[PDB]
Design a protein around this ligand. Structure first.
Ligand code: CLA
Ligand code: CLA
Ligand code: CLA
Ligand code: CLA
Ligand code: CLA
Ligand code: CLA
Ligand code: CLA
Ligand code: CLA
Ligand code: LMG
Ligand code: PQN
Ligand code: SF4
Lengths: 617, 89, 645
């Protein structure tokens, strides 16, 4: 069989998980089963990490000297290595805080890690079993009550493995006792606890029990608010999916911020590379989740919404105002941030760094001094010094941070502009009044009416994902350079050279690439060789994305037609291949745009990961 | 022995201490592989179930459990709707 | 009347409501020089050519004016080793740091080769250049408004045009330049190299000067005429005399009775002549770029390294652009001709030629970049003996290392030019060949699939420049010959960028190697290019990142302008990415929302805001991409070669 084209692959694989179009498992029970399978995959991935850490790793040597040992991820057995590279490499080092997490949550041996891997595999088996039997009964599982109960149970675990649990007198048997007895496992000290330079395990356990109880109460309050005023007027998998994705993106970005500034894993701030990778990774995940929330909002508009006088109807009626005002905000922010950066570039270039426009971030400084800082650092708003201050890793801002935050605002507002514009024009524009009948994603409407390239709602996400990556790159450059200056004790090279963008080149990118490029050269290769190779690979992927984005189909379709002609006219092969089976055709326009975006972002992520590793190694 | 690359590895002087023994022996690795084989069998079952979809007779010939009956009747746990929403309330 | 017709395009734009859009303005700009087929097409073309000649004369006059007034040309004459600066920069804003700008156009060496020793001569040349520009503008006016139709010059009077260009223009210009050399450019350089003062140039035309002071016709003159800065001018004079003789003799000893443009319309004939002329000019530019550093011809030229680098890179870029435009205008001529039956053999071997070129490009790309990636992988894996280098698997270019032949009274260029090649040269030359082949593939595909293709069967009805045929047949975007030129321009950019990178790294490597000292005579490899230009990582580290220190640390120095242009080029290149990746429809809807915002405030522009058309968007993106990449390379090369040389 198989008398289709290669277009069939990229047509179905783009909707292979669009289960709403899959009439077989279209019921919500099947979607919950997909969630169970995904959680089984997550459990097996965590089992992978724990198994390779406990198998070939130094966790037993890590708990003894967490500052003087480098965590090992897995053993390297690449056959392509040369004996020297084999002698050179010990094992694949660790770029994630799993050693720190295991140390925090009470792991003290490789036997405990092995039992954890077995438990993760068994839990993945349980998830697969649950996915085997989709059922309205299983739809009962879940809810904010369930996640709050999970938080309470995690609090119980952390109490059981808090460092002070040994001094804890059994509360459930000998009564609550004195307050210090509970303080052995439940504290609210606040901020870094010194030593481990992270939040106390007692703080985390107390946090989790409080969060679980409050979540139970909030869920009960929300359900009684559903008792009276019971209105599920708009139910859609995409509406709820957008809600979940936006909340998850907010939570993940907040996780990045508050895990850098309030690390909860012992001896984490001493490991610079893992901290930077944590922040960058979680910020990328949060931005992706927010973008997905916007995308699924657009999809809900496309194929699940019915016009009414509701919240969404009001948003749609004045969509011109929303788009115009967002465009004004983006134009103002971009104009001014770019102009101030160019002015600083000109002043620094012309040997007159004093004449730069350095607008002091007085509002954020006011917030920091009045609400956060316990000592007079800037002196504006307040100058009181705290008698008993608490510790954390909140950076001290300066003039460059104003421009960087305005760049961040420009990026966020432009991304929101593209996403909102596409979602609200999914209902139709004057160039495409009937977009409600064309689906979320389509190539174009042809060359007529002046041209309709990238007019689809999916193309709005395609355009906005470049802006997502650009905004995350901007503020991750900000975070990475800030923490590099703090760790290298410069803190003045940043505060002066971040005002102009040539500083962002010379002192950040060109400066921090010196060791990465020396991963392998004529002299030899060191442990950074893999990351220089990945740097090059990511650049190659990025430029292949350039190929798929710049050059469009028709050319490539004609070229592939000529290649098919060569094959059909070739000897020894026209007897075997008649091009009828899986006919080679050029990628469709939507498929090409998505694949170009995928290469672009893959090169983006891998390039920045390699750079972060080579800079903070 | 490794050739250190990166300013912070040299500056902080962190040493990659290889454990003297392995850590998981060989028997426990075999047990992990066996459990992963069972998980793989379950995954094959799940893949077969999902690829062919849900048959039409089940959820139509199998009577709903009294829990499911009362939940659908009263509209609970995502019923009375067309969404999944694991974080419902 | 004529003034009324000067804005006639705008009057026609506003006359019809269909042309009251910004798209009409962009079309008015895009169709500016697209002289439509008419009875006066040849007049229009010739007058436009003469106007361009006048513009170039304005440029030459300005350059000589800067040499006369805003240059240290006299100081450079007294000491060629100093930095040639010919652009004063006034103290406005804070730009005073870069007040002397080291010009790298080679005008100082050119003027020294012309016997110019006084800034008064430069003033006179600037004035005569302005006069010549005025004359060219007068002639262009005249030809556009009152002259012959010129429609017979490409078909009927092609023999007369070709014969005049062969004899008069080319041969007589070469002979006149040989006379100028022998009479004022050789004696002035003699009297400057000997330091015995230079008289007025006309006094050399006295029949009582060195012309008859001594009648000896070899390398022997007053005191000791052993100047080796002077011999290249002697060789140039001999070359020009011989070339004039051979041109004049062969023009009357040539048939020239074969005009292949009988079967083409006048517009298509003009486009085909423009295409072949662009091909010749581009290959001539590339040849001159190679020969500038291959053979010394200007006084104190090789010593001024920034000038050599700038000449090479500029002429390589111009050659690449003109080579692409050659195929562009060949496609225009083919698609716009009613009966272009002349290219029947190639339009009937369409798929054969295209597919064989496709295999050639695939083979070259996989092989060359696989050698590079294999070297990268082996060096990363710590396997330097498995790489492709001299100390490993050696890809010695054997075909390069042989030019021996029977002497028959010859010398010098009877060898490999005294330079040894290695594996790095082999691999980079194959990269150049592959990139050139890919550019040619795109251009030839655009030419062949211009009138019809297997996908769209009436592409000749769509003319030369169209956005697409529609999203049908899976999608037919970028099928036009214009879009093929659009992609071929990107691939030309890639090819020429790699070519100039190879040249610049080889040049810097040779400069470092000759800076051995004198005693150091085992260069081993060293030769930073030869030792490191075998990996992509090798390039990224030892060329781009290594030489970027000069351009990024230029702030507060005279090269701060190069640093700022580096940044601006990156900015323009990312803006190109904006234009190339996006599409017209989205921007149209955004403009709809913005225009609602305008209408809400009673603003309501009548030239309806339309976003750039698909082809216009692609063209803007390509223009910004070329500008950004070429400007980045320009700033990088100039800062690196001026700071370090
Ligand atoms: C839990 C979150 C969640 C869930 C359940 C869904 C669910 C869904 N999404 Mg969705 N989405 C999400 C998050 C989520 N999304 C996020 C966060 C974003 C923003 C990035 C999007 C953006 C998005 C778009 C733009 C679209 C969907 C669509 C869909 C539907 C079809 C999915 C499909 O078949 O895609 C197919 C899935 C793929 C083709 C996966 C691609 C494979 C990746 C790219 C492999 C590359 C990685 C590679 C290994 C890296 C190599 C590196 C290199 C160096 C070697 C489905 C209902 C589609 C839809 O509903 O249209 C009607 C659609 O068009 N989503
Ligand atoms: C959110 C709740 C939560 C979570 C995620 C964990 C997670 C963990 N606990 Mg734990 N714990 C909790 C609550 C929790 N605990 C509470 C409330 C208590 C107090 C009673 C404890 C007391 C406790 C002890 C005393 C120990 C752990 C240990 C562990 C670790 C390995 C356990 C394992 O997989 O092997 C055991 C489990 C299996 C082999 C199979 C899994 C059990 C079923 C089949 C799966 C459950 C399905 C799921 C509920 C849905 C793991 C990190 C061990 C460790 O080394 O940590 C440092 C350990 O010794 N826990
Ligand atoms: C460096 C590259 C670059 C730049 C500058 C821009 C710039 C812009 N994009 Mg964009 N984009 C890019 C790459 C880039 N993009 C890429 C690669 C993609 C992926 C396809 C996109 C996708 C994209 C989408 C989907 C959208 C944008 C939008 C915008 C605009 C946002 C408003 C703004 O910031 O105005 C600021 C403008 C600039 C910074 C441009 C430079 C202007 C000057 C040179 C700088 C200021 C100098 C000075 C102050 C002026 C002097 C005044 C007087 C003295 C003469 C803006 C014009 C949005 C838009 O148009 O909304 C309005 C939008 O919806 N872009
Ligand atoms: C080939 C074209 C060309 C180019 C690119 C330039 C470029 C330049 N010329 Mg120039 N020039 C040219 C042809 C050219 N010239 C010709 C043909 C003449 C002869 C009439 C001159 C005569 C000339 C003088 C007399 C001066 C310049 C100056 C300048 C510089 C500043 C111009 C200025 O102040 O703007 C002013 C523009 C206007 C007022 C708009 C009209 C700038 C580098 C100035 C300079 O270098 O200052 C130190 C200066 O004083 N030029
Ligand atoms: C939006 C961004 C932005 C902003 C706010 C500024 C603002 C400024 N720039 Mg600047 N600049 C920018 C972008 C920007 N620039 C860009 C993109 C570049 C790169 C080309 C430069 C390059 C640059 C240089 C090279 C210089 C400045 C200078 C200046 C300052 C003097 C302006 C002046 O006197 O104008 C003169 C014009 C007026 C005063 C207008 C007349 C007054 C009006 C008509 C009154 C109307 C009635 C009320 C001013 C603070 C100068 C400086 O150093 O000052 C500190 C200077 O030398 N800029
Ligand atoms: C000895 C006489 C003589 C000389 C010196 C020139 C010199 C020139 N002619 Mg020319 N021409 C001549 C006789 C001459 N022509 C005759 C007799 C005819 C009639 C057939 C033409 C018809 C002609 C045309 C149609 C064009 C030139 C053009 C040119 C210029 C560029 C030539 C080029 O690049 O190739 C081409 C050059 C200044 C070109 C130009 O730039 O126009 C100004 C151009 O388009 N010539
Ligand atoms: C001898 C040289 C020569 C000549 C006479 C022509 C003549 C022509 N070409 Mg052509 N072309 C050439 C070389 C030449 N070309 C080369 C080398 C290329 C490859 C790059 C092309 C590629 C090309 C294409 C792709 C097309 C033409 C077209 C045309 C026709 C209309 C041109 C028009 O309206 O432009 C009007 C003038 C402009 C648009 C100039 C605008 C400025 C350009 C776009 C960018 C300049 C940026 C500048 C260098 C940087 C600024 C400075 C910076 C510091 C800011 C006309 C017959 C068009 C056609 O339809 O032909 C029938 C067409 O579609 N040509
Ligand atoms: C395309 C460019 C290219 C080339 C020429 C090579 C060449 C080589 N690589 Mg290599 N490599 C490349 C790209 C390339 N690599 C890339 C991109 C990567 C990254 C994935 C690698 C990664 C890599 C590794 C990891 C290793 C090599 C190794 C090798 C060597 C042995 C390979 C082998 O077994 O040959 C297999 C060759 C064949 C099976 C024959 C194919 C060619 C035949 C002769 C074509 C004949 C066509 C015929 C004339 C058609 C006409 C027929 C008609 C007349 C009838 C060899 C020197 C190995 C090594 O260390 O050796 C030094 C090794 O371990 N490579
Ligand atoms: C590091 C990871 C970062 C890289 C991943 C970034 C990917 C961006 C996330 C966006 C994914 C959602 C996009 C999507 O599903 O629609 C992107 C499009 C959507 O699908 C398109 O839908 C259209 C109508 O809606 C038409 O049917 C098109 O034919 C169909 O392709 O999907 C595709 O184009 C898939 C083609 C590529 C499939 C290759 C599979 C790759 C698996 C290798 C592993
Ligand atoms: C942005 C964009 C537009 C919108 C572009 C428009 C509407 C052009 C109008 C832009 C104005 C004319 C910019 C004017 C110049 C700027 C102010 C910058 C130059 C001057 C400064 C340097 C001071 C398209 O129409 C388009 C079409 C097809 C593919 C991609 C795109 C595309 O990316
Ligand atoms: S086919 Fe291609 S060029 Fe034509 S409108 Fe569609 S996307 Fe644009």
């Amino acid at each position: 069989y198989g008398r289709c084209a290669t277009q069939r692959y990229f047509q179905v694989l783009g909707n292979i998980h669009d289960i709403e179009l899959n009439e077989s498992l279209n019921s919500p029970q099947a979607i919950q089963a997909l969630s169970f399978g995904q959680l089984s995959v997550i459990l097996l991935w965590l089992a992978a990490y724990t198994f390779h850490i406990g198998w070939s790793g130094n966790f037993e040597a890590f708990i003894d000297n967490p500052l003087g040992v480098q965590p090992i991820n897995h053993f390297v057995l690449d056959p392509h290595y040369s004996q020297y590279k084999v002698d050179t490499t010990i094992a694949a080092l660790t770029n994630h805080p799993i050693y720190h997490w295991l140390m925090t949550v009470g792991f003290t041996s490789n036997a405990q890690i092995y039992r954890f891997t077995l438990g993760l595999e068994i839990t993945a088996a349980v998830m697969l079993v649950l996915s085997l039997a989709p059922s309205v009964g299983l739809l009962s599982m879940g809810g904010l009550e369930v996640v709050s109960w999970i938080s309470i149970c995690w609090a119980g675990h952390l109490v059981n493995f808090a460092p002070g649990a040994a001094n804890l007198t059994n509360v459930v048997m000998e009564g609550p006792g004195s307050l210090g007895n509970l303080m052995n496992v439940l504290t609210f000290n606040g901020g870094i606890q010194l030593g481990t330079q992270a939040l106390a395990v007692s703080d985390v356990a107390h946090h989790h029990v409080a969060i679980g109880i409050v979540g139970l109460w909030i869920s009960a309050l929300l359900r009684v608010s559903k008792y009276a005023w019971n209105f599920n007027t708009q139910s859609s998998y995409h509406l709820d999916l957008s809600l979940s994705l936006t909340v998850g993106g907010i939570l993940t970005s907040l996780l990045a911020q508050q895990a850098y500034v309030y690390p909860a894993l012992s001896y984490l701030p001493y490991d610079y590379l893992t901290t930077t990778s944590l922040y960058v990774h979680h910020q990328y995940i949060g931005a992706f989740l927010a973008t997905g929330g916007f995308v699924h909002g657009g999809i809900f508009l496309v194929r699940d919404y019915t016009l009414s006088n509701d919240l969404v109807g009001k948003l749609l009626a004045t969509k011109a105002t929303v788009i115009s005002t967002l465009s004004w905000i983006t134009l103002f922010l971009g104009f001014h941030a770019t102009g101030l950066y160019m002015h600083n570039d000109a002043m620094a270039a012309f040997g007159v760094p004093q004449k730069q426009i350095i607008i002091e971030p007085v509002f954020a400084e006011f917030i920091q001094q009045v609400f956060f800082l316990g000592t007079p650092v800037y002196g504006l708003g307040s100058a009181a010094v705290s008698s008993t201050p608490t510790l954390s890793f909140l950076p001290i801002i300066s003039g460059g941070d104003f421009l960087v935050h305005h760049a961040i605002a420009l990026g966020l507002h432009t991304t929101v502009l593209v996403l909102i514009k596409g979602a609200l024009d999914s209902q139709g524009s004057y160039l495409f009044p009937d977009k409600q009948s064309f689906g979320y994603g389509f190539a174009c409407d042809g060359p007529g009416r002046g041209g309709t390239c990238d007019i689809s709602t999916w193309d709005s996400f395609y355009l906005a994902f470049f802006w997502v990556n650009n905004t995350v790159a901007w503020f991750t450059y900000y975070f990475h350079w800030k923490v590099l200056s703090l760790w290298q004790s410069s803190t003045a090279v940043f505060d002066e050279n971040s005002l102009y963008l040539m500083g962002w080149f010379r002192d950040y990118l060109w400066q921090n690439c010196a060791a990465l490029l020396s991963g392998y050269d004529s002299l030899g290769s060191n442990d950074l060789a893999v990351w220089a190779w990945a740097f090059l690979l990511a650049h190659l992927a990025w430029a292949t994305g350039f190929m798929f984005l710049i050059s469009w189909r028709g050319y490539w379709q004609e070229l592939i037609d000529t290649v098919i002609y060569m094959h059909l006219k070739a000897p020894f092969f026209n007897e075997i291949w008649s091009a009828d089976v899986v006919t080679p055709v050029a990628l469709s326009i939507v498929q090409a745009r998505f694949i170009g975006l995928a290469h672009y972002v893959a090169g983006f992520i891998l390039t920045y990961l390699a750079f972060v590793v080579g800079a903070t190694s | 022995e490794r050739i250190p690359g990166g300013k912070f590895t040299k500056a902080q002087g962190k040493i990659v201490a290889t454990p003297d023994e392995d850590g998981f022996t060989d028997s426990e690795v075999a047990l992990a592989l066996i459990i992963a084989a069972v998980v793989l069998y379950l995954a094959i079952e799940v893949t077969k179930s999902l690829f062919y979809g849900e048959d039409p007779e089940t959820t139509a010939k199998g009577p709903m459990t009294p829990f499911e009956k009362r939940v659908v009747e009263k509209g609970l746990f995502g019923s009375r709707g067309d969404s999944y929403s694991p974080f419902r309330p | 009347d004529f003034s009324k017709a000067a804005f006639g395009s705008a009057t026609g734009l506003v006359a019809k409501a269909a042309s009251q859009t910004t798209t009409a303005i962009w079309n008015l700009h895009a169709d500016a020089h697209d002289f439509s087929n008419s009875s006066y097409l040849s007049k229009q073309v010739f007058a436009a050519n003469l106007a361009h000649i006048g513009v170039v004369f304005i440029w030459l006059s300005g350059m000589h004016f800067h040499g006369a007034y805003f240059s240290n040309y006299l100081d450079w004459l007294q000491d060629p080793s100093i930095a040639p600066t010919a652009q004063q920069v006034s103290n406005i804003a804070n730009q005073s740091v870069l007040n002397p700008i080291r010009v790298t156009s080679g005008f100082f060496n050119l003027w020294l080769a012309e016997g110019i020793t006084s800034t008064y001569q430069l003033k006179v040349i600037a004035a005569f250049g302005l006069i010549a520009s005025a004359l060219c503008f007068l002639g262009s006016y005249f030809h556009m408004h009152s002259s012959t139709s010129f429609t017979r010059v490409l078909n009927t009077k092609l023999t007369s045009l070709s014969t005049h260009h062969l004899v008069g223009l080319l041969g007589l210009g070469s002979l006149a330049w040989a006379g100028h050399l022998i009479h004022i450019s050789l004696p002035v350089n003699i009297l400057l190299n000997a330091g015995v003062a230079v008289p007025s140039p006309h006094s050399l035309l006295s029949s009582k000067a060195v012309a008859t002071i001594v009648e000896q016709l070899s390398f022997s003159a007053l005191t000791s005429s052993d100047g080796y800065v002077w011999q290249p001018l002697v060789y140039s004079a001999m070359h020009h005399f011989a070339l004039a003789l051979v041109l004049i003799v062969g023009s009357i000893f040539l048939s020239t009775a074969s005009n292949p443009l009988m079967s083409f319309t006048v517009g298509s004939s003009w486009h085909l002549v423009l295409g072949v002329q662009l091909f010749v000019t581009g290959t001539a530019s590339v040849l001159y770029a190679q020969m500038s550093n291959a053979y010394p011809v200007y006084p104190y030229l090789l010593t001024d390294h920034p000038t050599v680098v700038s000449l090479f890179v500029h002429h390589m870029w111009i050659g690449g652009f003109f080579l692409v435009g050659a195929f562009a205008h060949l496609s225009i001529g083919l698609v716009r001709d009613t009966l272009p039956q002349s290219f029947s053999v190639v339009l009937t071997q369409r798929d054969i030629i295209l597919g064989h070129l496709t295999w050639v490009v695939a083979f070259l790309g996989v092989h060359s970049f696989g050698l590079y990636v294999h070297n990268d992988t082996m060096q990363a894996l710590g396997r330097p003996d498995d790489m492709f280098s001299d100390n490993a698997i050696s890809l010695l270019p054997v075909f390069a290392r042989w030019s021996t032949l029977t002497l028959n009274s010859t010398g010098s260029a009877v060898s490999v030019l005294g330079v040894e090649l290695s594996t790095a040269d082999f691999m980079v030359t194959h990269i150049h060949a592959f990139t050139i082949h890919t550019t040619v593939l795109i251009l030839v595909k655009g030419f062949l699939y211009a009138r019809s293709s297997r996908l769209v069967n009436d592409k000749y009805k769509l003319d030369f420049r169209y956005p697409c045929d529609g999203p049908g047949r899976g999608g037919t975007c970028q099928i036009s010959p214009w879009d093929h030129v659009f992609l071929g321009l990107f691939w030309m950019y890639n090819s020429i960028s790699v070519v100039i990178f190879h040249f610049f790294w080889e040049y810097q490597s040779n400069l470092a190697s000759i800076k051995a000292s004198a005693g150091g005579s085992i260069r081993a490899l060293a030769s930073d290019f030869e030792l490191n230009s075998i990996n992509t990582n090798g390039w990224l580290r030892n060329f781009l990142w290594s030489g970027a220190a000069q351009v990024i640390q230029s702030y507060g120095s005279p090269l701060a302008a190069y640093g700022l242009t580096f940044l601006a080029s990156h900015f323009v290149w990312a803006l190109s990415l904006m234009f190339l990746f996006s599409g017209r429809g989205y921007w149209q809807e955004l403009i709809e929302s913005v225009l609602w915002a305008h209408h809400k405030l009673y603003v309501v522009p009548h030239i309806q805001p339309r976003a750039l058309s698909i082809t216009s968007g692609r063209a803007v993106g390509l223009t910004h991409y070329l500008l950004g990449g070429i400007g980045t390379t320009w700033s990088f090369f100039l800062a690196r070669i001026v700071a370090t040389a």
